[PDB]
Amino acid sequence: DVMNRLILAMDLMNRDDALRVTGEVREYIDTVKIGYPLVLSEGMDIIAEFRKRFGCRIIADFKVADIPETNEKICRATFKAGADAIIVHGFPGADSVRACLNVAEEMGREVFLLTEMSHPGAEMFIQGAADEIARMGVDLGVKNYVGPSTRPERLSRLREIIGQDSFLISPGVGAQGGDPGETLRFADAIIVGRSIYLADNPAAAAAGIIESIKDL
Amino acid sequence: RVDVMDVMNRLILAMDLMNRDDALRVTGEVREYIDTVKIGYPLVLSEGMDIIAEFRKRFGCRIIADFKVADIPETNEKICRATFKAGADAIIVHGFPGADSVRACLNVAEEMGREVFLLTEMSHPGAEMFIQGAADEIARMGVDLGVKNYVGPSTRPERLSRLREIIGQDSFLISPGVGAQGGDPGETLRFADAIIVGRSIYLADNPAAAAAGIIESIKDL
Ligand SMILES: O=C1CCN([C@@H]2O[C@H](COP(=O)(O)O)[C@@H](O)[C@H]2O)C(=O)N1
Ligand SMILES: O=C1CCN([C@@H]2O[C@H](COP(=O)(O)O)[C@@H](O)[C@H]2O)C(=O)N1
């Protein structure tokens, strides 16, 4: 359940800068996506400090993409550190995804499957496998997916493959060129980074996104 | 080649033990046999990125951060910069996300005077689903991008042979999957400049013995 269907992609690599901008929009968002830029620079503990400070949900955007054995250790360390869910790459195959799924089940946490990416290079290899990956996710029982806001038509095919009962979130809104509303037509929530945290006033920017989405 | 950074004994230790003391102890025990250590997320996420500078100072070993960077260009650059800032000598990047994603890593590597290793084909079974079908092209893309260091699968020597003929004799190839995953040090080293070995060594009763034994079976070839 994402407040305002808006998730913040906190990719500032500065703890102060990060905590500060995440406080300037906490009233608008209650779900934060934390990735390696911040975790590698400030440590895995930044996750508990984010929870303690903002009492927000944490999605670790780690794009796990290793062999099953290692994917298990990465997920375990990520959940131990307190992440509510972790985003996993599907291109490595079914056994690699099933590894994070097992650890998510064992620790009562969630796995989000990244099927298609939002950037241009994504066309070379990812795009053509996107559907088979989303399908693999269905066979595996994955209920949470991540799809490209930059390609509304693709984001739409993804939603018809995963079904209406699946939770779908989508990055690539704003900076990369995606439109909130058009994205929210198929996705449950949008992920927005630079458009908020690189803004003179993140509080406003965020608000502005919600104001053009209340009409939804 | 010779215009590349070699690895002592063609053996790279994959240190994936998840706690500082055991990692430091096991690595110290085999330090005599290797001079390149591959540190991944299992260790870094449990003990912090400072662990990279500590291994580097303590052992005088070169560090390869096996982070498999696989994000968009903008984020890949921040990940590589943080990794190099942490002191790593190289970083392993996935190729499946495309050329623009690899170039972002390469820009920061050459900017900071570090290396990038491109992961073309993976070594687990699931790697046959979508990565194997794109591997030759990912390798071709890396050669075109200027990539000189690659990572290929020990578990599939015929596939590793194809990689080597795609990247040529001057490129540097390292390969995982030897031991716990079933790969043999011999066949692999016919194509790869060096093997990456984790569990066969760090979970052995006696790590030093395990490492010396491998280096021996390699010695004759
Ligand atoms: O397909 C993907 C992979 C995940 N992401 C992640 O979503 C976030 C987007 O931030 P921006 O809104 O500034 O583009 C960023 O953390 C990025 O790494 C993608 O943008 N696209
Ligand atoms: O294709 C790949 C990706 C990198 N790796 C990495 O190589 C290391 C192998 O350790 P083992 O030797 O115990 O299998 C481990 O850290 C693993 O994550 C692969 O094994 N295969």
Curated annotation (Swiss-Prot), chain B:
Pfam families: OMPdecase (PF00215). Keywords: Decarboxylase, Lyase, Pyrimidine biosynthesis. It catalyses: orotidine 5'-phosphate + H(+) = UMP + CO2. The active site is at 68 (proton donor). GO terms for biological process: 'de novo' pyrimidine nucleobase biosynthetic process; 'de novo' UMP biosynthetic process. Substrate binds at residues 16, 38, 66-75, 123, 176-186, 198-199. InterPro entries: Aldolase_TIM (IPR013785), OMPdecase (IPR014732), OMPdecase_arc (IPR047595), OMPdecase_AS (IPR018089), OMPdeCOase_dom (IPR001754), RibuloseP-bd_barrel (IPR011060). Gene3D superfamilies: Aldolase class I (3.20.20.70). Homodimer. HAMAP family: OMPdecase_type1_A. Belongs to the OMP decarboxylase family. Type 1 subfamily. This is Orotidine 5'-phosphate decarboxylase. It comes from Methanothermobacter thermautotrophicus (strain ATCC 29096 / DSM 1053 / JCM 10044 / NBRC 100330 / Delta H). The gene is pyrF.
